[PDB]
């Protein structure tokens, strides 16, 4: 819950 | 007992205008423009996309995953700080949210 996917520069990072 | 309305001064009020705009180039979908519309508006600011990403998680007070007029205004209100060689505290206060989204009770 703490990866948040509401974000467009916060999705996903390393894999 | 009849409450007054809480009418605080919010900033944003100023720049809207300008956003409102802005947010009809990008392609207002419903009134509501998404993460991707917004996503290059944000890379067109010439900004780290770590600051991108912190715009956008203050500014998206819905946490809803789109930016409407006026959270859109308020990201780019974000932004225009960071140019203006400033730096937004990772406050929201009453003066920057958004009435649409202040918790009474
Ligand atoms: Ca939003």
């Given at each position: 819950?703490?990866?948040?996917?509401?974000?467009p520069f916060?999705?996903?990072?390393?894999? | 007992?009849?409450?007054?309305?809480?009418?605080?001064?919010?900033?944003?009020?100023?720049?809207?205008?300008?956003?409102?705009?802005?947010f009809?180039?990008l392609?207002?979908?419903?009134?509501?423009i998404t993460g991707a519309n917004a996503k290059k508006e944000m890379?067109?600011?010439?900004?780290?996309?770590?600051?991108l990403?912190?715009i956008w998680?203050?500014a998206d007070?819905?946490?809803?995953?789109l930016l409407?007029?006026?959270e859109f205004?308020?990201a780019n209100?974000?932004?225009?700080?960071?140019?203006?060689?400033?730096?937004?505290?990772?406050?929201?206060?009453?003066?920057?949210?958004?009435?649409?989204?202040?918790?009474?009770?």
């Open positions: 819950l703490e990866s948040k996917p509401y974000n916060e999705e996903e990072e390393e894999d | 007992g009849p409450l007054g309305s809480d009418d605080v001064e919010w900033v944003v009020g100023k720049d809207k205008p300008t956003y409102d705009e802005i009809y180039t392609s207002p979908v419903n009134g509501k890379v067109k600011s010439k900004l780290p996309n770590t600051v990403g912190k998680k203050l007070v819905d946490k809803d995953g409407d007029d006026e205004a308020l209100h974000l932004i225009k700080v960071k140019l203006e060689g400033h730096e937004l505290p990772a406050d929201l206060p009453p003066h920057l949210v958004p009435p649409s989204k202040r918790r009474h009770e």
